[PDB]
Amino acid sequence: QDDVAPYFKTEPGLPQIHLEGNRLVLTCLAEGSWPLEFKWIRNDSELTTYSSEYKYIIPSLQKLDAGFYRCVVRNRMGALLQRKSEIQVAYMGNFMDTDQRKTVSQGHAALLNLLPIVSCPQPQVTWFREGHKIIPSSRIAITLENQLVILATTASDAGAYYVQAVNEKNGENKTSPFIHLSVARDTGTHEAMAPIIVVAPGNRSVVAGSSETTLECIANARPVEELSVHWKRNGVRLTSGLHSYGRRLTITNPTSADTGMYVCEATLRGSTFEPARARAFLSIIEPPYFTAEPESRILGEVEETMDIPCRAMGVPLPTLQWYKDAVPLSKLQNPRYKVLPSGGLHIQKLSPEDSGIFQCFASNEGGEVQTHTYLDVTN
Amino acid sequence: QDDVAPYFKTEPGLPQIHLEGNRLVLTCLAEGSWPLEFKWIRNDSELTTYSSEYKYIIPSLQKLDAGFYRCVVRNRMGALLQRKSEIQVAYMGNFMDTDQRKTVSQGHAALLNLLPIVSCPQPQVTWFREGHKIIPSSRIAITLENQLVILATTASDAGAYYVQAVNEKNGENKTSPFIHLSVARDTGTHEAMAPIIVVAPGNRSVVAGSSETTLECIANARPVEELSVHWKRNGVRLTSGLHSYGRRLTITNPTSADTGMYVCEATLRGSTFEPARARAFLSIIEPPYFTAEPESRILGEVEETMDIPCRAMGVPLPTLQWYKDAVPLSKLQNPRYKVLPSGGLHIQKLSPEDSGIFQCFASNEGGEVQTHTYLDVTN
Ligand SMILES: *[C@@H]1O[C@H](CO)[C@@H](O[C@@H]2O[C@H](CO)[C@@H](O[C@@H]3O[C@H](CO)[C@@H](O)[C@H](O)[C@@H]3O)[C@H](O)[C@H]2NC(C)=O)[C@H](O)[C@H]1NC(C)=O
Ligand SMILES: *[C@@H]1O[C@H](CO)[C@@H](O[C@@H]2O[C@H](CO)[C@@H](O[C@@H]3O[C@H](CO)[C@@H](O)[C@H](O)[C@@H]3O)[C@H](O)[C@H]2NC(C)=O)[C@H](O)[C@H]1NC(C)=O
Ligand SMILES: *[C@@H]1O[C@H](CO)[C@@H](O[C@@H]2O[C@H](CO)[C@@H](O)[C@H](O)[C@H]2NC(C)=O)[C@H](O)[C@H]1NC(C)=O
Ligand SMILES: *[C@@H]1O[C@H](CO)[C@@H](O[C@@H]2O[C@H](CO)[C@@H](O)[C@H](O)[C@H]2NC(C)=O)[C@H](O)[C@H]1NC(C)=O
Ligand SMILES: *[C@@H]1O[C@H](CO)[C@@H](O)[C@H](O)[C@H]1NC(C)=O
Ligand SMILES: *[C@@H]1O[C@H](CO)[C@@H](O)[C@H](O)[C@H]1NC(C)=O
Ligand SMILES: [Zn+2]
Ligand SMILES: [Zn+2]
Ligand SMILES: [Zn+2]
Ligand SMILES: [Zn+2]
Ligand SMILES: [Zn+2]
Ligand SMILES: [Zn+2]
Ligand SMILES: [Zn+2]
Ligand SMILES: [Zn+2]
Ligand SMILES: [Zn+2]
Ligand SMILES: [Zn+2]
Ligand SMILES: [Zn+2]
Ligand SMILES: [Zn+2]
């Protein structure tokens, strides 16, 4: 009857990373009764006013333009809110031009942290010692956080260390100042060192159906050539997915059967030392999906009870928030509406102002899904 | 021992769609014994020669630059091949400036196909009839392929139809030529038309863990207001996920429990007609993941048997192809190597030339995963 509330024809997709200086165009393509008006919101902050323009163009991207973008479509029926889309910008700043110093006792592991640098994403790092490149070996490792771990340091390891960082999205490179490493002699007890875990695998959670995830576990011992790092699950040692001298375990395409505890066990062959063990817990997060959605339109007699269902499942439990014509009920401050723990919304006393778009957003760490309905209040 | 075969520090990610004229930078970030050399391959065609440059820059993107890109890293040990990354370019051409004509009998459904236009992705379409916008109603639908379906056509539906197409990535719009629709009178049997499915839901397969998928089923009958389209599974009618007058069923976050048959059933209320039914089969494709990978390095005595394992799982079964220093064994034409159905590779007689990188690519419709190993041939 030419009284159709807006709805989106396009599903905003996955996060996209774009280079600086590039032209970016965002579209708010909806379907409903004409004329329609569109406005844009970035980080819960309005960018544009309502107009007939359905696209937002950034001729040259900047670091500030990055954020979560939304668009609001509105007509005589009400206003509808789009699912947020993450717009990331590729940028790489400089290091702070101040050299650092660090001293480590001989035989103990030395961890050199990548000097602070702002970059999205974090650049890949190539470590050097006075021009000579450092390759990961049995006693040298590079963490997922670009930390240089030198197991069983010696007097030959003293020197100025630096990196060449490269951003994998825009290709820019930056050279870091020096970390002057000094190795101090400790008295020669260090002939056989018990295996001790230096970088332990922390708790990790990943999205369902994702490509792969990688846990890291680095240990130190002497002699380092006899050091063996293994991975166990349910008390059973693993074989597939290992990388980088057994220090990285990659679980590819994890499901609900891959959740639980993974144990890192570092042993020293030919020795009676107790193996050093660490715990790591892998969790699978499920994106929210509705098991009950409100019908597209619902009639309502003035001052009569009304329940608007909205139930969603997924791990962890999705958190739900409502909107009335693209306005949160938390900021709407109306005692007429009352949120329901089971999922829906309860409105006991109606009013001619209650007519409009009601939108239920279910969100967790795995993203968000939204449903909506138009409340028609009879005369 | 400073003899490390190359391996990639970066995991090439999901397909990315970029606008025309934008600057694109691709990086081949690997780790191994220096110096390393890099070259780029697009659509199994070499773009650059071997050099010390690790990035490939397109200052201004074009429609021709779209394709699957790979990079090859090489040193004294051998050559390694990167997983392909899909580079899509946003472009929108024009329609062929020639109007079309179509005649449909009165009371029968009329399908108007979107006129041919080259665009990536396919644009969202807004249908018009001589300036007046056409909104989907109980007798008017728009398919996923942007087809205009007019159920129970009448004499008032005759006229020139056209569209305004908008590319959702770059925002460009194009206006289509006219489809002159003529409605021809057929003798008045058309008072109660049995429900007949016009657009049936075909077979559909989607990736595991994907956001959502949508099946479409459109039917025609008279009177159209009494037409009801429902969805059944296991003989049980569905309630959630329905859209567009019950013509679209959206299965969000499908798993192995959502595969099987979905039935579309269109009924005419208040009538004794037989419901029109259609079959649609939803399949879940699992990306390939290795259950057995070859160790990073393997020793080999000259002219001795050798088996290199490489087993992967996923639905449908992954297809495996091998490479020797980034060169396919199919094009290598060596009877020494022989592929194994169980998964691996069998080399019975060795040779000093057999030393190098061997790479096993497991690929299906859900993507590809690769493993590699260095064959060291003893003197
Ligand atoms: C718009 O909102 C986004 C999201 O809040 C802002 O991105 C934030 O930017 C900060 C730094 O500016 C980043 O912090 C990063 O997150 C980790 C979380 O563990 C933090 O520990 C690190 O320091 C890391 O740098 C991150 O991208 C993000 N922070 C959060 C909490 O989301 C963005 O800056 C906002 N832009 C505008 C223009 O408002
Ligand atoms: C590099 O290779 C890609 C992949 O083969 C090429 O993309 C191809 O481009 C065609 C049209 O140029 C497209 O065809 C499309 O696929 C469906 C498949 O059902 C087809 O029926 C439609 O006609 C649709 O247009 C598609 O993007 C793709 N085709 C295939 C089979 O992959 C690309 O053009 C190549 N570029 C260069 C520079 O070599
Ligand atoms: C790191 O980036 C700089 C640019 O910021 C590169 O320096 C360029 O080198 C090329 C030839 O090698 C010159 O034509 C350019 O003029 C240089 N740019 C500037 C701003 O001077 C440098 O080569 C990069 N390093 C690596 C290892 O790739
Ligand atoms: C479709 O795109 C054209 C451009 O190709 C738009 O025409 C522009 O309109 C603005 C103001 O409306 C002018 O400032 C530009 O000069 C126009 N461009 C050209 C090339 O003339 C047109 O507005 C778009 N249509 C819609 C509905 O957005
Ligand atoms: C990891 O999660 C487990 C779950 O019980 C918890 O016991 C442990 O303390 C967590 N560790 C960290 C470092 O958060
Ligand atoms: C869809 O798949 C089923 C599976 O058996 C098959 O029987 C049917 O013919 C297929 N239909 C089409 C249109 O491919
Ligand atoms: Zn880009
Ligand atoms: Zn200094
Ligand atoms: Zn120590
Ligand atoms: Zn000591
Ligand atoms: Zn909906
Ligand atoms: Zn009304
Ligand atoms: Zn782009
Ligand atoms: Zn004409
Ligand atoms: Zn018909
Ligand atoms: Zn007839
Ligand atoms: Zn590997
Ligand atoms: Zn050797």
Side-chain angles (χ1 to χ4, degrees), chain A residues 2-75 77-303 305-330 332-337 339-348 350-379, chain B residues 2-75 77-303 305-330 332-337 339-348 350-379:
Chain A
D2 205 82
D3 286 331
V4 176
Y7 61 92
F8 297 100
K9 302 185 298 181
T10 62
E11 36 172 29
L14 305 137
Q16 42 188 3
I17 166 72
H18 303 295
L19 307 187
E20 280 181 317
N22 277 11
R23 175 186 176 93
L24 180 69
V25 175
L26 304 181
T27 61
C28 192
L29 305 181
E31 176 68 37
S33 299
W34 275 11
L36 294 172
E37 287 187 330
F38 315 94
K39 71 171 183 180
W40 290 91
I41 297 177
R42 177 187 62 193
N43 273 9
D44 300 330
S45 305
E46 294 191 3
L47 295 178
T48 57
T49 60
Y50 275 106
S51 63
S52 61
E53 184 74 5
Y54 51 91
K55 29 177 166 62
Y56 183 85
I57 301 94
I58 310 180
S60 183
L61 273 183
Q62 307 172 9
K63 187 264 179 182
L64 315 177
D65 295 318
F68 298 94
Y69 285 76
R70 273 182 160 98
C71 78
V72 183
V73 54
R74 185 190 65 189
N75 56 12
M77 314 301 292
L80 194 66
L81 183 62
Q82 198 183 45
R83 288 187 299 269
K84 57 179 181 180
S85 51
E86 184 176 4
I87 301 303
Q88 293 177 340
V89 180
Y91 59 89
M92 189 180 187
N94 309 267
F95 302 89
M96 46 183 62
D97 203 341
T98 50
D99 300 28
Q100 295 181 351
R101 287 140 288 272
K102 182 168 184 172
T103 306
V104 290
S105 55
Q106 193 179 42
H108 293 81
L111 298 86
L112 282 71
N113 300 273
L114 170 63
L115 286 82
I117 177 177
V118 189
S119 176
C120 179
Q122 279 301 308
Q124 292 296 333
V125 164
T126 302
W127 277 92
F128 294 88
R129 194 201 80 175
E130 303 177 1
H132 291 60
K133 184 198 178 186
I134 302 176
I135 308 176
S137 62
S138 61
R139 78 179 202 95
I140 290 183
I142 281 82
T143 73
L144 296 174
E145 303 81 15
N146 296 326
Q147 307 177 19
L148 176 61
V149 180
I150 302 180
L151 309 173
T153 54
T154 54
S156 306
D157 296 321
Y161 292 78
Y162 66 97
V163 314
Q164 288 182 358
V166 179
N167 191 323
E168 57 191 277
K169 292 299 180 178
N170 56 25
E172 303 178 6
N173 71 84
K174 296 292 186 299
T175 303
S176 160
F178 296 107
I179 298 182
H180 303 274
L181 180 60
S182 305
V183 278
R185 276 185 54 250
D186 52 344
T187 306
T189 282
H190 48 65
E191 286 293 337
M193 291 187 54
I196 171 178
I197 298 170
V198 178
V199 179
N203 282 349
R204 183 75 70 90
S205 57
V206 290
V207 194
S210 179
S211 181
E212 64 184 25
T213 180
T214 302
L215 305 180
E216 189 172 40
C217 180
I218 310 177
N220 177 86
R222 289 182 59 177
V224 69
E225 21 275 333
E226 317 297 332
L227 178 62
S228 185
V229 178
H230 296 273
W231 291 81
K232 292 181 176 298
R233 185 185 186 183
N234 308 329
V236 180
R237 184 160 293 184
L238 278 69
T239 305
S240 300
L242 283 74
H243 288 332
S244 298
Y245 299 84
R247 294 191 276 260
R248 295 186 176 184
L249 172 63
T250 301
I251 299 95
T252 168
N253 299 326
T255 57
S256 299
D258 290 329
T259 188
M261 167 189 291
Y262 294 83
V263 182
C264 170
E265 174 176 297
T267 62
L268 183 60
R269 299 188 299 266
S271 177
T272 63
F273 289 146
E274 289 75 8
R277 293 180 179 85
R279 304 189 309 177
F281 296 104
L282 181 62
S283 302
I284 302 300
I285 55 104
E286 291 281 358
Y289 69 97
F290 295 111
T291 181
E293 308 179 36
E295 296 185 357
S296 57
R297 294 184 180 272
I298 46 180
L299 294 176
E301 323 87 348
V302 177
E303 300 162 353
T305 177
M306 170 59 61
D307 294 327
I308 308 178
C310 178
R311 298 189 298 270
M313 286 187 175
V315 291
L317 51 87
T319 58
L320 301 86
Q321 62 172 336
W322 285 76
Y323 289 82
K324 189 269 184 300
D325 297 338
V327 172
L329 296 194
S330 309
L332 201 62
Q333 303 289 345
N334 274 341
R336 306 172 182 86
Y337 327 118
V339 194
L340 217 168
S342 300
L345 182 66
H346 186 88
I347 316 173
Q348 40 184 341
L350 288 188
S351 178
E353 302 296 317
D354 296 27
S355 59
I357 292 295
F358 282 82
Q359 200 171 356
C360 180
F361 275 86
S363 57
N364 74 332
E365 195 177 7
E368 58 177 33
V369 290
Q370 54 86 17
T371 177
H372 61 90
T373 175
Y374 180 86
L375 178 60
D376 183 22
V377 179
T378 65
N379 47 11
Chain B
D2 205 82
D3 286 331
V4 176
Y7 61 92
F8 297 100
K9 302 185 298 181
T10 62
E11 36 172 29
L14 305 137
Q16 42 188 3
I17 166 72
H18 303 295
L19 307 187
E20 280 181 317
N22 277 11
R23 175 186 176 93
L24 180 69
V25 175
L26 304 181
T27 61
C28 192
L29 305 181
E31 176 68 37
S33 299
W34 275 11
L36 294 172
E37 287 187 330
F38 315 94
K39 71 171 183 180
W40 290 91
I41 297 177
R42 177 187 62 193
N43 273 9
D44 300 330
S45 305
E46 294 191 3
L47 295 178
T48 57
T49 60
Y50 275 106
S51 63
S52 61
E53 184 74 5
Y54 51 91
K55 29 177 166 62
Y56 183 85
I57 301 94
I58 310 180
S60 183
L61 273 183
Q62 307 172 9
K63 187 264 179 182
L64 315 177
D65 295 318
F68 298 94
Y69 285 76
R70 273 182 160 98
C71 78
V72 183
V73 54
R74 185 190 65 189
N75 56 12
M77 314 301 292
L80 194 66
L81 183 62
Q82 198 183 45
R83 288 187 299 269
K84 57 179 181 180
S85 51
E86 184 176 4
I87 301 303
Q88 293 177 340
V89 180
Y91 59 89
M92 189 180 187
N94 309 268
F95 302 89
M96 46 183 62
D97 203 341
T98 50
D99 300 28
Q100 295 181 351
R101 287 140 288 272
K102 182 168 184 172
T103 306
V104 290
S105 55
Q106 193 179 42
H108 293 81
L111 298 85
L112 282 71
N113 300 273
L114 170 63
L115 286 82
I117 177 177
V118 189
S119 176
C120 179
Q122 279 301 308
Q124 292 296 333
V125 164
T126 302
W127 277 92
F128 294 88
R129 194 201 80 175
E130 303 177 1
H132 291 60
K133 184 198 178 186
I134 302 176
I135 308 176
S137 62
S138 61
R139 78 179 202 95
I140 290 183
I142 281 82
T143 73
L144 296 174
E145 303 81 15
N146 296 326
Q147 307 177 19
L148 176 61
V149 180
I150 302 180
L151 309 173
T153 54
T154 54
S156 306
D157 296 321
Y161 292 78
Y162 66 97
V163 314
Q164 288 182 358
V166 179
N167 191 323
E168 57 191 277
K169 292 299 180 178
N170 56 25
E172 303 178 6
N173 71 84
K174 296 292 186 299
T175 303
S176 160
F178 296 107
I179 298 182
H180 303 274
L181 180 60
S182 305
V183 278
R185 276 185 54 250
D186 52 344
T187 306
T189 282
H190 48 65
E191 286 293 337
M193 291 187 54
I196 171 178
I197 298 170
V198 178
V199 179
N203 282 349
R204 183 75 70 90
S205 57
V206 290
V207 194
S210 179
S211 181
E212 64 184 25
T213 180
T214 302
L215 305 180
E216 189 172 40
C217 180
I218 310 177
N220 177 86
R222 289 182 59 177
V224 69
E225 21 275 333
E226 317 297 332
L227 178 62
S228 185
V229 178
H230 296 273
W231 291 81
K232 292 181 176 298
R233 185 186 186 183
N234 308 329
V236 180
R237 184 160 293 184
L238 278 69
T239 305
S240 300
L242 283 74
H243 288 332
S244 298
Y245 299 84
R247 294 191 276 260
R248 295 186 176 184
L249 172 63
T250 301
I251 299 95
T252 168
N253 299 326
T255 57
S256 299
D258 290 329
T259 188
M261 167 189 291
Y262 294 83
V263 182
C264 170
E265 174 176 297
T267 62
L268 183 60
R269 299 188 299 266
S271 177
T272 63
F273 289 146
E274 289 75 8
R277 293 180 179 85
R279 304 189 309 177
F281 296 104
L282 181 62
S283 302
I284 302 300
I285 55 104
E286 291 281 358
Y289 69 97
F290 295 111
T291 181
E293 308 179 36
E295 296 185 357
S296 57
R297 294 184 180 272
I298 47 180
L299 294 177
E301 323 87 348
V302 177
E303 300 162 353
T305 177
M306 170 59 61
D307 294 327
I308 308 178
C310 178
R311 298 189 298 270
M313 286 187 175
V315 291
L317 51 87
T319 58
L320 301 86
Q321 62 172 336
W322 285 76
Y323 289 82
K324 189 269 184 300
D325 297 338
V327 172
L329 296 194
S330 309
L332 201 62
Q333 303 289 345
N334 274 341
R336 306 172 182 86
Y337 327 118
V339 194
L340 217 168
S342 300
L345 182 66
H346 186 88
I347 316 173
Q348 40 184 341
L350 288 187
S351 178
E353 302 296 317
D354 296 27
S355 59
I357 292 295
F358 282 82
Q359 200 171 356
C360 180
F361 275 86
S363 57
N364 74 332
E365 195 177 7
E368 58 177 33
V369 290
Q370 54 86 17
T371 177
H372 61 90
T373 175
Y374 180 86
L375 178 60
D376 183 22
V377 179
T378 65
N379 47 11

